[PDB]
Symmetry: C3
Subunit: 332 residues, 3 copies
């Protein structure tokens, strides 16, 4: 009887940050309420000024990470304002039935809907838009995110002992397929609907023009680098709604990885690189042991360093010479 359960309202934050939550559940099951507003907007995705018409949940690519516990109810109010032009919906891979909620959430511009589902399976899961006849176009225009359903007693290692993270980041990786003219220049369109048939042709090549983290080439660099300190335990959630990726922390490892993101399974240990299949979210836990700049990449290095799938951590603290040292610096 759901009317007797506590309700809690959560305000979502922009990726790669994550809203505040408890790892170990401090209450019984709740109905957790979220609101998202669909925004169709122009996005500049690279250093050259290439623009697309992005389709977003809450104004960002990816959409924000939602965090609940196993056997909570998720109640989502989804708003499609009349400033948009397209019909949208939402499919949660975490949910059971009705095409993951897609069949129940079709909203024209000017409409809203509220869906509730029970989070019965622990893990990270993709959510994405999926309107009949236009599914890949929506998804590859940026309309995807993830939801983390924590076990009520938090995360566990391969022996069942507690694993506790100090920080958590969300990396959404996005494949874009920007249409090109005959010579290979990217095309521009006034509206999203203009691009439709050129978008289909670009997608059918199966060759993305850009692969980015957090919506743009270089989005997780500079002043937007991820930060941590030596000794901190960091959880990195990584989603790809459409195409396989293979994350790698340059200078580190995945100490504990759930590559396909489902926490009832034991993690894989000591990974150099792991495969997250398209349509999946995964999670990697790492304890930093050395200070400095780290790069976090898709380890198809072309996709990383030419197409955009690379970000940075900046880590503070003490250098450990036992782990690594230059015995003879580069010299003639």
């Amino acid at each position: 009887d759901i009317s007797t359960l506590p309700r809690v309202k959560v305000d979502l934050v922009k990726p790669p940050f994550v809203h505040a939550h408890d790892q170990v559940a401090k209450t019984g099951p709740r109905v957790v309420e979220f609101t998202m507003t669909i925004e169709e907007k122009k996005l500049v995705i690279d250093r050259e000024g290439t623009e697309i018409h992005a389709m977003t949940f809450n104004g960002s690519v990816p959409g924000p990470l939602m965090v609940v516990h196993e056997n909570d109810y998720v109640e989502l109010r989804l708003i499609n304002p009349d400033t948009n032009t397209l019909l949208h919906n939402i499919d949660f891979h975490a949910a059971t039935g009705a095409l993951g909620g897609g069949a129940l959430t079709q909203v024209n511009p000017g409409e809203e809907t509220t869906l509730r589902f029970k989070a019965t399976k622990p893990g990270v899961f993709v959510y994405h838009c999926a309107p009949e006849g236009m599914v890949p176009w929506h998804v590859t225009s940026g309309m995807n995110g993830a939801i983390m359903v924590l076990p009520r007693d938090g995360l566990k290692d391969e022996k069942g002992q507690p694993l506790t993270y100090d920080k958590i980041y969300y990396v959404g990786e996005q494949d874009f397929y920007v249409p090109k003219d005959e010579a290979g220049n990217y095309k521009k369109y006034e509206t999203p609907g203009e691009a439709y048939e050129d978008a289909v042709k670009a997608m059918r090549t199966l060759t993305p023009t850009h692969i980015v983290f957090n919506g743009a080439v270089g989005a997780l660099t500079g002043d937007h680098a991820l930060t941590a300190a030596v000794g901190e335990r960091v959880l990195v959630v990584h989603s790809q709604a459409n195409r396989d990726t293979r994350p790698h922390l340059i200078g580190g490892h995945g100490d504990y990885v759930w590559a396909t993101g489902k926490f009832r399974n034991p993690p894989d240990l000591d990974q150099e690189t792991w495969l997250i299949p398209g349509g999946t979210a995964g999670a990697a836990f790492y304890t930093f042991r050395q200070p400095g700049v780290y790069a976090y990449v898709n380890h198809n290095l072309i996709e990383a360093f030419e197409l955009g799938a690379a970000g940075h951590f900046k880590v503070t603290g003490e250098w450990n010479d036992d782990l690594m040292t230059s015995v003879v610096k580069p010299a003639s």
Copy 2:
């Protein structure tokens, strides 16, 4: 001494159905006899009327699923009638030696051969044609299928308790590479041999023109949708003989998945999407909990909704509002 073992003759059925078998072995080891006849035939693969010269085992793409138990002997009579034009053979990934039987089964049109092998390893496995110098052409023309070798005591969960399926379906996913003229129109050929050099060039792009389930775009839809009922336990065997795929049940999960298809390993639990590498068969077990239409896709959504890798389940029974419900239907 094989002459003292019982012999049983099995008649194969068309995919996505599977011949009758026992999950838990009701007899000791047997020699299980199968016959397959190679058919080269014209196939229409999409709604536009694109035709290829398919190369098939038993007239279907994929070839039929064979089912035996661990330590049975498989005896296959392979017939290549003189109405075909090409040399064929068979390679079982389940078998040990002689290129999986490929070296022993080369049959010109007008010839037959009988191979026997012992099924020493439990799991689902690919089989495919593999004639010297023309291996990918045969495979990507549809000449592949799968064989399931059940443990003698049936399937087990991650704790070693019995898992029993009520229904079993076989989904063969096929990458096709249809040659195109300069403008991008699909070419046509009177005979398979005509296509050879254009087929090689099309394959070398590594970009399939169509990716389909059960031999055609929309083959597992409409009146050919897969069916189940709420509460039924369904095993879905999925093979891809040449290229990676990432199955996903839209509105459901893989409760227990053997992504690389080998049953001595514990299954992965609660999967949203799983990766079956090319040259592998995998298996996913799901208990349906909600009625309605489900879509089963390769979750590269371009491959699914543009190139053809999507089918449907239609599930009957009672809706459960506790799992999912529309709190406020789409409204202005």
Copy 3:
């Protein structure tokens, strides 16, 4: 205190062979010293005489396999002679900090450097060149290899019992992207630097022109086939520094596979085919049971038989008819 540890100098051997080592450690932790010399050289990669400017560690593609034990120190002297033209470095995925050593090992032609790191995590790991702004170009020109960090007590099966290999081979798989003129003919260049902008354009297609084992189409065939005997236990280490692969032994299996190469995890059993993600090394253990020719392939069969990713084992000994036999040889 590292000055009190024994030092041992190892001389590396050309792939696919591996330098002599102990499986179970016969000493305490050591500093293990290796030298590698960078060689930029012309390489013929296919039967047609296509040439590239390869960038190599120690003259080979892949670079040589290094073998140490968990908690040894690796000390590498890296030499870039003044006959080379480019700046190089090395990144070990086995190492912790400084971009896997990349930040500390930048060597112009005419320079050398010595790096030491502690091998804290057991497994096979990729190493590769990774100079700032030119990472994929170096890697896809062949500048990668692998390092195996054995547990001090050797390898273990899924139950923790010892697994001992009689032979070990290293297969480096390399994706090349040879630039093409308008008609599709491969281009030629006097120097590596000439190719730079054409190399970037070729890479951005994400479509390799050649995928090879040990640096050339057909390198592991003929008199260079891998050898074994019936009853031998063989470990095959396989790396791919940039792109996913799916190894398969034709006529055999992976009895025990660490697909992502990290030995603290239990192996997967009875694999037909396994996925090694790009930027990973994996390892497969097999006991041969039948004599004859086996092919070891990437089971995207186009990549194998058209693009070059295939090699051979030749296995000697006794044929076992119980496992497989021709009951009726091919006949009219």
